[PDB]
RNA sequence: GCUUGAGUCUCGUAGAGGGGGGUAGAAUUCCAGGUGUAGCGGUGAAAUGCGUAGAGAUCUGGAGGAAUACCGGUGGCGAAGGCGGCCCCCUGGACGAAGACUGACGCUCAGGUGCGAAAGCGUGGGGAGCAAACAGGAUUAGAUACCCUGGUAGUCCACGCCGUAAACGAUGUCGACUUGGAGGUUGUGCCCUUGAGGCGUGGCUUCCGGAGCUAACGCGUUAAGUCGACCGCCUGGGGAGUACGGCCGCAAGGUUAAAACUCAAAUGAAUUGACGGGGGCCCGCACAAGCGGUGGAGCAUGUGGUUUAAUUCGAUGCAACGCG
């Protein structure tokens, strides 16, 4: 979660949060408890991941 | 006044508004500025521009403390936050840490229903 | 413009000063295909402009037009189902094209006697940037300055 | 009698199988306090709402309830419903390896009995979040809706009831046989284990496909192929899974289950097109960028209407209206 750097620093370059929290994990927990849509969203996500 | 010389910039980016609170390392607030309090009410208070002018305006109003070092703590998602920390090192601050402190439940409370828009 | 990227046609420069800039200014002023009339108006008006300001001809014109050129202008998007007025940087040819259109339009708005006096007084009011075309430029810049939040 | 079906014993393996008890960490809400100050929240935009009685932000301390991120996987377990932190206790099943034992003890099953999501019901608790009802704000022609702000039952626990779901692989159970390929998961044997190998042999499971079948779509060794055993159910659409009666249920209702009348269709799958406020690519003064008009005035001319003895007939969205 943290970053620090010594005096050679210019830019933020914190892409630790395109790794874990920001993009998916908080936008996922904005909306409803189903049990049902996730079983089919994961079903078609794993059925789309195919050659 | 009171001459703290190090603080924390808690930026609270949400989808509708970013609210920047500059405090000390004890956690006592020294002065805040919101994107909605800088003109541009409404669809324009959730933009990176509004967040950066919110952060410029929060860098003002803590001149009475002589803050040079600060950590940055970032909550929430938002069109803000990224631009926000930029405005902080456009205001002479030595930005030391950038932590992202978004609250994530370990499957806690049930989130609200919504949005069949 | 759907498909066709275009060239542009070359205008003959001004027959008194060799200025294609001022040639496009007499084309912006021209009505009903009467070019002789419009260049008479431009020569009279800029001649009294050069006599009044005492500078010279087309540097008095170039100053009076430099005060009315827009910096950035608003522009509609309609991308996310919403009406945004985004600010966008004006191209130089469009920059002085808008400058001349605002000078000429504001000069047609004025209430003096002859067109050479309306436009000579409009360029003179734009030399110390207090006329109507500068209020059009400040108006455009208030729109693009208020809506700066979209880039 | 016999062991190739079924079962017992020995040793292990994997597992969100079940029931009871405890605990942990993040987060939400509330309460008390510090800093601090003008907004916060919300939306397509807003407003209701909260806020100078000091909100929101931020830090500290506390309480409480529910759910258990990451692992997490067309992964696993379960007859099905379903089961997801970690630990203990009680407990069910499955699978594998070698050997021993019983010796057809088997398969299916009407009535019967049990289990059976969610909502609901009863009694007693609990109540943080979420949220039917409800209230307010918007949107709209209206808006008893979608959106916003609140919000009660309920969701959670104990015991009892209900007894249903698109309770679905829309595929009853058990057994046998019939070309293949790529995986996943869990055992086990053999070989230099010369490593994240090589060769087999089981259990469960995913995707694609051969013959075959199928109205087609598709199924395809986990069959919808080729057979056998037993059960359940169907007989045109509507009326109607309704009424009456019976049984069950506290009720809601559940189950069993018609007829009169009425139609000549209702239906399945696939084809061609058209359409979509579906998707991709592309064009045209289509939009955009501009310039000049029309709609306002007077007149010209055409039309509708009205008038008239007649105001000849035809043209009438675009593509009729100085048109024939």
UniProtKB/Swiss-Prot annotation, chain A:
Biological process terms from the Gene Ontology for this record are:
cytoplasmic translation; ribosomal small subunit assembly
Q: Give the transmembrane region(s).
A: none
Q: Name one GO molecular function term.
A: rRNA binding
- Composition skew (Basic residues), residue ranges: 43-51
- What cystine pairs are annotated? none
| Keyword annotations from UniProtKB, A to Z | Ribonucleoprotein, Ribosomal protein, RNA-binding, rRNA-binding
Q: Name one GO cellular component term.
A: cytoplasm
- Describe the task this protein carries out: Probbly involved in recognition of ribosome rescue factor SmrB in stalled/collided disomes; fusion of protein fragments to its N-terminus decreases ribosome rescue in the presence of SmrB.
Give the record's subunit note.
Part of the 30S ribosomal subunit. In stalled ribosomes contacts ribosome rescue factor SmrB.
Which family is annotated?
Belongs to the bacterial ribosomal protein bS21 family.
Q: What is this protein called?
A: Small ribosomal subunit protein bS21
From Swiss-Prot, chain C:
Which Gene Ontology molecular-function terms are recorded? mRNA binding; rRNA binding; structural constituent of ribosome; tRNA binding
Listed under GO biological process in this entry are: cytoplasmic translation; negative regulation of translation; ribosomal small subunit assembly; translation
Q: What does this protein do?
A: One of the primary rRNA binding proteins, it binds directly to 16S rRNA where it nucleates assembly of the head domain of the 30S subunit. Is located at the subunit interface close to the decoding center, where it has been shown to contact mRNA. Has been shown to contact tRNA in both the P and E sites; it probably blocks exit of the E site tRNA.
* Protein name, as recorded: Small ribosomal subunit protein uS7
Q: Which lineage is the organism of this entry classified under, starting from the top rank?
A: Bacteria, Pseudomonadati, Pseudomonadota, Gammaproteobacteria, Enterobacterales
Q: What else is known?
A: The strain K12 sequence is shown.
Q: Which organism is it from?
A: Escherichia coli (strain K12)
Keyword check for Ribonucleoprotein, yes or no. yes
How it assembles, according to the record, is: Part of the 30S ribosomal subunit. Contacts proteins S9 and S11. Cross-links to IF3 and the P and E site tRNAs.
Identify the keywords attached in UniProt to this record, alphabetized. Ribonucleoprotein, Ribosomal protein, RNA-binding, rRNA-binding, tRNA-binding
**Superkingdom classification of source:** Bacteria
What family does the Swiss-Prot or TrEMBL record give for this protein? Belongs to the universal ribosomal protein uS7 family.
Q: What does UniProt give as GO cellular component?
A: cytoplasm; cytosol; cytosolic small ribosomal subunit; membrane; ribosome
Keyword hit for RNA-binding: yes
- The residues forming a coiled coil are none
Q: Would you indicate the residue range of the signal peptide?
A: none
């Amino acid at each position: 979660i943290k970053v620090r750097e010594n005096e050679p620093f210019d830019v933020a370059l914190r892409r630790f949060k395109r790794s874990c929290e920001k993009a998916g994990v908080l936008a996922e927990v904005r909306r409803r408890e189903f049990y049902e849509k996730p079983t089919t969203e994961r079903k078609r996500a794993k059925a789309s991941a195919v050659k | 006044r009171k001459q703290v010389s190090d603080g924390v910039a808690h930026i609270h980016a949400s989808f509708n508004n970013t609210i920047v609170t500059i405090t000390d390392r004890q956690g006592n607030a020294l002065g805040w500025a919101t994107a909605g309090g800088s003109g541009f009410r409404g669809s324009r208070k959730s933009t990176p521009f509004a967040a950066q002018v919110a952060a410029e305006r929060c860098a003002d109003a803590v001149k009475e403390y002589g803050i040079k070092n600060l950590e940055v703590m970032v909550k929430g998602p938002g069109p803000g936050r990224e631009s926000t920390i930029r405005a902080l090192n456009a205001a002479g601050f030595r930005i030391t840490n950038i932590t992202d402190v978004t609250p994530i439940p370990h499957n806690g409370c049930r989130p609200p229903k919504k949005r069949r828009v | 413009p759907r498909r066709r990227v275009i060239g542009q046609r070359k205008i003959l420069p001004d027959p008194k000063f060799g200025s294609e800039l001022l040639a496009k200014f007499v084309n912006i002023l021209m009505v009903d295909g009467k070019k002789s009339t419009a260049e008479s108006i431009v020569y009279s008006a800029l001649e009294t402009l050069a006599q009044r300001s005492g500078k010279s001809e087309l540097e008095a014109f170039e100053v009076a037009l430099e005060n009315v050129r827009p910096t950035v202008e608003v522009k509609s998007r309609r991308v996310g189902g919403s009406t945004y007025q985004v600010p966008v940087e004006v191209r130089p040819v469009r920059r002085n094209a808008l400058a001349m259109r605002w000078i000429v339009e504001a000069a047609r708005k004025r209430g003096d006697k002859s067109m050479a006096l309306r436009l000579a007084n409009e360029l003179s009011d734009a030399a110390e940037n207090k006329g109507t075309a500068v209020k059009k430029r400040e108006d455009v810049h208030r729109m693009a300055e208020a809506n700066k939040a979209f880039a």
